[PDB]
């Protein structure tokens, strides 16, 4: 405890002294660059996209979102995005098929690992597809925390 | 002043600190995570061949 | 110094340009390039140059 | 059963445009139906 | 065994601050790399140096 | 007497919305004669805060 | 929030005692210090939790979800 | 860093429970109480630099 | 020549190589072999996280105003001396039309999507003998309507003409030539919510209007020369199906529409009540 | 789960209910057990049901 | 599951404990901070009368 450190009872931590929740959100939506056809919230498979990450996209669903209540590790993607351009010769040129991805998916932050809770989608100001998710984490006290 | 005289580097770490009266002065305690991220090359000699083989 | 510094060299007549490694297109990383500041200024320079010479 | 939208338990089972403004409600925000998949915890 | 000197003791009110160590631990060996100056990038979240 | 008052509406609505979202206290002309920290984001870590 | 289970200091189960400690103060008109004494919490590490725990759970509960 | 100290070398003992860890006597040259301060690590990469770091 | 590089492991060679990116290490590795290929990757997301040229064209846009570290008289001198190259480019006309359609779209409180679509529509043709002037009203209104319609925001020609009168004829010819130009280079149900918005009614009459419009569309009676009129009298018979006083005498000037057409639609649905009500 | 109360609260507050353990010596650790995944001879199973009646 | 109190406070039966020896301080394993009297300023142990003064 020298120089303001503290000794703290492990057993009180175990019983539940100073436990806490942690809520994080993310925001993403389709963008229109048209010739008005916009991006899509689909589930990117292997032969659709380019240079997509190793996030192991299995946690998503057919509508390109994750379900509430499942757990997520550090590198799991939560949102699926795909480039609607056109003009890029979008599945006929300067890429194989690998259809039209140029995948713009949003992975989770690289460290924390919570549980997906309360995902909603509603259109934005002008009318798009606009998504907010939320993930929830338990944060037990450890050595370095500051009181 | 921001790219020549001083700069970003590599091979570094940054945490917070706490006391310990079971380390003598030339020692420092490092988390296993940090020591798993950082590294340091060694050249393979006759002397260290087995140890490095095991460690690989 | 005549071999390195001359007052008639001290007036700009022919202007070097730097290659894109000095002034990289930042490649805006959503869909676009967002191509950068120095190249914008050089495009301005060459536009005013051709305007002056056609007017002349 | 795919979307919630409200205080109503309107299981919209949405494909596309089946009155996202759900019939018993008025809402148009479309909340999204916590999974049936089995989840694990750890009561350490 | 008994301690010699008797000590102070009692309840007291604390609160837990947000600066938690799990957001401040950070390390990098040979990561990503800036474009204009070809240096290690910034950002603890961005795995910087 | 009708068509221009709607773009007028855009101008004053855009101006107020911009000033409050940014904090610079002046119209969309790169903040002359203005102050910066005027419209901070509400702090919501704790009711007391 | 509910009352805690299990006083952090000591470990004795608390949480059975909560609504009892309430109705000791509703109809019995009893002083609360004697109420905890008659509830039977003679150490004070246990005593602090019942005496200081606030019940936010019903204030949460007065919404109408689903 | 202000004076000749606060770049000091150490030997490393790997410890669990992620945070740094150092002896209490060396605290005042670093000028660092444990109120939430943070240090920096710098791993040398070759034999010359390891040797001169250890010997100075 | 083509100058192109494809990565290939020089010790596996079994395919276009199945490699991966180790982004936190900035390296690429032959995943089947394990040897690194190239190192020190360049960032691909923090550059976007740091912070329209295509609509504005190849020439580069410049919003130039006044600064802070100079005198006000010198800012006025800057404003007077910055206007020396507003005639060399056709981009002056491009942002002139852009400013005009900005005024028109944001006066019509339209979305940014609609604004950019109209920008695209003007930029695509932008100069032809097929354009041939037309007072810039025909082409701007046509481009705005095409972009707003292809953003699936259908607006009425009466509202377009009330915003900008283009005498309903040159507007039509310009719409046809824009149609032909875009055809070479290559929604009535959506009108109802705006009118019930202008009348202030809940969702169930809207749903009833959609059902009645689709059903009367399915069978017969185009009945009216742009049957937006009978689409409106669908709402009229819905509100007669309910009991809220929204009298046709009010409705005619509420929607700038003929009351006789309302009564004719009332008659043609009087004899056709049979299959238009769901519950 | 549907309640206001959070899931890991439900877990943690479950974890602290004391249980009858007279006969604790009869069974063995999950650890040391010959089985896998909670046989009756190393563990016991509990079930909860609730309703907003 | 089985579990023991060493790795979690779930598995405790203990819940409290008490401990005392030489309530009269005859062994002199402590001496009392005070300002007038050790005897006056400290309360007597409950276990005093079990041994002679
Ligand atoms: Zn609803
Ligand atoms: Zn206690
Ligand atoms: Zn290989
Ligand atoms: Zn077993």
From Swiss-Prot, chain A:
The modification Phosphoserine is found at residue 86. Mg(2+) binds at residue 4. It comes from the Eukaryota. It is found in: Nucleus. Belongs to the RNA polymerase beta chain family. The binding of ribonucleoside triphosphate to the RNA polymerase II transcribing complex probably involves a two-step mechanism. The initial binding seems to occur at the entry (E) site and involves a magnesium ion coordinated by three conserved aspartate residues of the two largest RNA Pol II subunits. Present with 18700 molecules/cell in log phase SD medium. DNA-dependent RNA polymerase catalyzes the transcription of DNA into RNA using the four ribonucleoside triphosphates as substrates. Second largest component of RNA polymerases II which synthesizes mRNA precursors and many functional non-coding RNAs. Proposed to contribute to the polymerase catalytic activity and forms the polymerase active center together with the largest subunit. Pol II is the central component of the basal RNA polymerase II transcription machinery. Component of the RNA polymerase II (Pol II) complex consisting of 12 subunits. This is DNA-directed RNA polymerase II subunit RPB2. The lineage of its organism: Eukaryota, Fungi, Dikarya, Ascomycota, Saccharomycotina.
Swiss-Prot record, chain B:
It is found in: Nucleus. The tandem 7 residues repeats in the C-terminal domain (CTD) can be highly phosphorylated. The phosphorylation activates Pol II. Phosphorylation occurs mainly at residues 'Ser-2' and 'Ser-5' of the heptapeptide repeat. The phosphorylated form of Pol II appears to carry, on average, one phosphate per repeat. The phosphorylation state is believed to result from the balanced action of site-specific CTD kinases and phosphatases, and a 'CTD code' that specifies the position of Pol II within the transcription cycle has been proposed. DNA-dependent RNA polymerase catalyzes the transcription of DNA into RNA using the four ribonucleoside triphosphates as substrates. Largest and catalytic component of RNA polymerase II which synthesizes mRNA precursors and many functional non-coding RNAs. Forms the polymerase active center together with the second largest subunit. Pol II is the central component of the basal RNA polymerase II transcription machinery. During a transcription cycle, Pol II, general transcription factors and the Mediator complex assemble as the preinitiation complex (PIC) at the promoter. Belongs to the RNA polymerase beta' chain family. This is DNA-directed RNA polymerase II subunit RPB1.
Swiss-Prot record, chain D:
Its main location: nucleus. It comes from the Eukaryota. GO terms for biological process: nucleolar large rRNA transcription by RNA polymerase I; ribosome biogenesis; RNA-templated transcription; termination of RNA polymerase I transcription; termination of RNA polymerase III transcription; transcription by RNA polymerase I; transcription by RNA polymerase II; transcription by RNA polymerase III. The N-terminus is blocked. GO terms for molecular function: DNA binding; DNA-directed RNA polymerase activity; zinc ion binding. A zinc finger (C4-type) spans 5-25. Zn(2+) binds at residues 5, 8, 22, 25. It is found in: Nucleus, Nucleolus; Peroxisome. The keyword Zinc-finger applies. GO terms for cellular component: cytoplasm; nucleolus; nucleoplasm; nucleus; peroxisome; RNA polymerase I complex; RNA polymerase II, core complex; RNA polymerase III complex. Keywords: DNA-directed RNA polymerase, Metal-binding, Nucleus, Peroxisome, Ribosome biogenesis, Transcription, Zinc, Zinc-finger. The keyword Chaperone does not apply. Belongs to the archaeal Rpo12/eukaryotic RPC10 RNA polymerase subunit family. Present with 907 molecules/cell in log phase SD medium. This is DNA-directed RNA polymerases I, II, and III subunit RPABC4. It comes from Saccharomyces cerevisiae (strain ATCC 204508 / S288c) (Baker's yeast). The chain holds residues 27 to 70 of 70 of the full protein.
UniProtKB/Swiss-Prot annotation, chain J:
It comes from the Eukaryota. Disulfide bonds: none annotated. It is found in: Nucleus. Zn(2+) binds at residues 33, 35, 39, 42. DNA-dependent RNA polymerase catalyzes the transcription of DNA into RNA using the four ribonucleoside triphosphates as substrates. Component of RNA polymerase II which synthesizes mRNA precursors and many functional non-coding RNAs. Pol II is the central component of the basal RNA polymerase II transcription machinery. It is composed of mobile elements that move relative to each other. RPB3 is part of the core element with the central large cleft and the clamp element that moves to open and close the cleft. Seems to be involved in transcription termination. Belongs to the archaeal Rpo3/eukaryotic RPB3 RNA polymerase subunit family. Present with 10000 molecules/cell in log phase SD medium. Component of the RNA polymerase II (Pol II) complex consisting of 12 subunits. This is DNA-directed RNA polymerase II subunit RPB3. It comes from Saccharomyces cerevisiae (strain ATCC 204508 / S288c). The lineage of its organism: Eukaryota, Fungi, Dikarya, Ascomycota, Saccharomycotina. The chain holds residues 54 to 106 of 318 of the full protein.
